[PDB]
Structure 1
Amino acid sequence: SDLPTTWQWTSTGPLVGPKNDGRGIAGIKDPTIILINGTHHVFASTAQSAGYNLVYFTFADWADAPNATFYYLDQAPLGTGYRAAPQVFWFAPHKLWYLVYQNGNAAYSTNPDINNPKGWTAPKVFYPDGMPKIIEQNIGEGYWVDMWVICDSASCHLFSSDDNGQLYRSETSLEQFPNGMSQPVIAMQDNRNDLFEAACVYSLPDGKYLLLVEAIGTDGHRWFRSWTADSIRGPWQGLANTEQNPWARSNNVQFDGDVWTKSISHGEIIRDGTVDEKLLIDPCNIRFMYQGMDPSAGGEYNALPWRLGFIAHNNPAC
């Protein structure tokens, strides 16, 4: 509607990477990002071969991202252990910020003040009885990953992937959230590489919804596919979801300076304005914080040199 069926982008250079601070982190990854009156708030995965946890950092101008201080959330009650792939939003019924992420289950922490990285609660889980049978049945050799909540004015939905080609969806009422999530349905299914992980589900000003999912291309590089729908529940119609017409991929991203990555991987659209549980974006002014890496690098996945930049949407349709 106010979305083009073809997409073009401009990318920054790699702005955010690990600090030389003794933690040994290899990759900074999987950002969630919101913008409040000039100030960006970011949460990201820390990745290395010993494990994953979470970091917070903030900055106004993008040029200040590289020197932004890292506030590691293992200093909060959120703590040490496995945590990855965060999502932040204000949950207006509770007047608390939620941070959704994975820990082997689907988890959340809350905090009344986004500026306090020490304030994030120890995790609670959306599935207190463990991994749903449907996921156990279909996961194969995959991993349960990349949790995402979006609500409308009646219901809150929790999406997740299995790195095996399923996208799962559970729901509960707005009034019960975070409790009472249903056993998931398979919301969408494809071969592994075509519907792999890193979903985002957004609302649009015209009342429709946008689904982005990360995929692994025939060249082995990460890219994003897209769909729209009239309902969070689907059905989903292709938007830009092929290699020749991608949402974001090496063939529709132009670099300012060097071409520092071929993969366009796990990211989020910068949500400004309301930063609440409706996950509204402005289709006229899309910017996407994403992860990339030197396309010549290899080795163990967990020690890959992931860095964060942004792509800015060049051909807005409004």
Structure 2
Amino acid sequence: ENLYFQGSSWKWVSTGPLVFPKNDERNIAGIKDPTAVLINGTYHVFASTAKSEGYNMVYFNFTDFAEANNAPFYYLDQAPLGYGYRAAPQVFYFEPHKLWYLVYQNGNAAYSTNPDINDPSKWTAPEVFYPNGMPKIIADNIGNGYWVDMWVVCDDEEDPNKALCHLFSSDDNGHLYRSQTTLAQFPRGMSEPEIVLQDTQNIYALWEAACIYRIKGAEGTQKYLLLVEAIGQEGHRYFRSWTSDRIDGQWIPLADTEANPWAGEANVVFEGQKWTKSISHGEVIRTLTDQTLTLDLSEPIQFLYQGVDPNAQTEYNALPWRLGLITQ
């Protein structure tokens, strides 16, 4: 029963908007870039806060999607994680350390740790995966882009000296990069990145917000699923997809057009409130929470994403993003 690996015909239903910025003195414009896990009935979400003044991050939890908007926000600048530019989190449990990791950007590829996801006050001040700064290959190829959207995924090889931990990132210039280190060394020792995919003619076809997941029980050419956000010809965001037999393998398109996306306006049905034409920077809500980023596709995917009123006219950082949910 790999029932929910839908090949080239993915189909979704979206909720209305589920999470809004608070009406508090921070005057946040958008809630963005979610990462989420479900643990014994509680959803744990980390997201970016966005306004023209800057970016930081929030943590919140809830048990019912209809009540998510009422969840109190823990502003992570109150933890050692702290004030400053931080955005676009990914959360997973790194089992060999018995620590949760929060991977995100701060100008570099960064991470924080915490032994208990339920205690957001303990997230550490950032440490970076690239101690000397922006890698040469990224500085050489970024142009007028931005180094964004960091993603870790580890293979499940039992031997920690053979098992690899991969770190992907984008440049808003048409490149997708990948570094690696062994499980034994992680988070230390990330290699110089390599460009693994590029779209030089249309940079917007391979834009940002990459996700790489393991498909549980899949052992061949569709073992790994790559999602990347693209911008369509009328400015609407959607996700392209590819598959491979390994994380550092060759990626072959799966559902990779605007007309037939992994998720986009074309294949998402709003059965209730219809509030966005963009399906942007999202993540699958994971129940298998460890560093292998494994999805069980015997069950429907829930993908928490950011959407926005298509009629909004603001500067990009002031756009009124809200979180919503698509379900198979």
Tell me the TM-score normalized by structure 2: 0.94
Of residues 60, 84, 88, the one that matches 1:85 is 88
RMSD: 0.9
CA distance in 2: counterparts of 1:96 and 1:171, whole angstroms: 20
CA distance in 2: counterparts of 1:280 and 1:136, whole angstroms: 32
3-state SS of paired residue (1:170): strand
State whether structure 2 residue 253 is matched by structure 1 residue 238.
yes
Of residues 276, 287, 292, the one that matches 1:278 is 292
Runs of 4+ in 1 over 4 A off after TM superposition: none
CA distance in 1: counterparts of 2:46 and 2:57, whole angstroms: 7
Q: Percent identity?
A: 70
Q: 1:120 maps to which residue?
A: 123
3-state SS of paired residue (1:93): helix
3-state SS of paired residue (2:89): strand
Tell me the TM-score normalized by structure 1: 0.97
Letter in 2 for 1:131: M
Q: 2:145 maps to which residue?
A: 142
Q: 2:104 maps to which residue?
A: 101
Q: 1:316 maps to which residue?
A: none
Of residues 224, 227, 241, the one that matches 1:212 is 227
Of residues 244, 265, 276, the one that matches 2:280 is 265
State whether structure 2 residue 41 is matched by structure 1 residue 12.
no
Q: 1:195 maps to which residue?
A: 206
Q: Deviations over 1:102-142 (max 9, x none)?
A: 00000000000000110000000000011011111111110
Q: Deviations over 1:122-166 (max 9, x none)?
A: 000000011011111111110000000000130100000000110
CA distance in 2: counterparts of 1:58 and 1:281, whole angstroms: 21
Letter in 1 for 2:303: F
3-state SS of paired residue (1:89): strand
Work out the number of aligned pairs and report it: 312
Shift of 1:64: 1.5
CA distance in 2: counterparts of 1:192 and 1:120, whole angstroms: 35
3-state SS of paired residue (1:224): strand
Structure 1: unaligned runs, 5 residues or longer: 314-318
Letter in 2 for 1:242: T
CA distance in 1: counterparts of 2:271 and 2:76, whole angstroms: 33
Q: Deviations over 1:161-207 (max 9, x none)?
A: 00011000000000000000000000111131000000101001114
Structure 2: unaligned runs, 5 residues or longer: 158-162
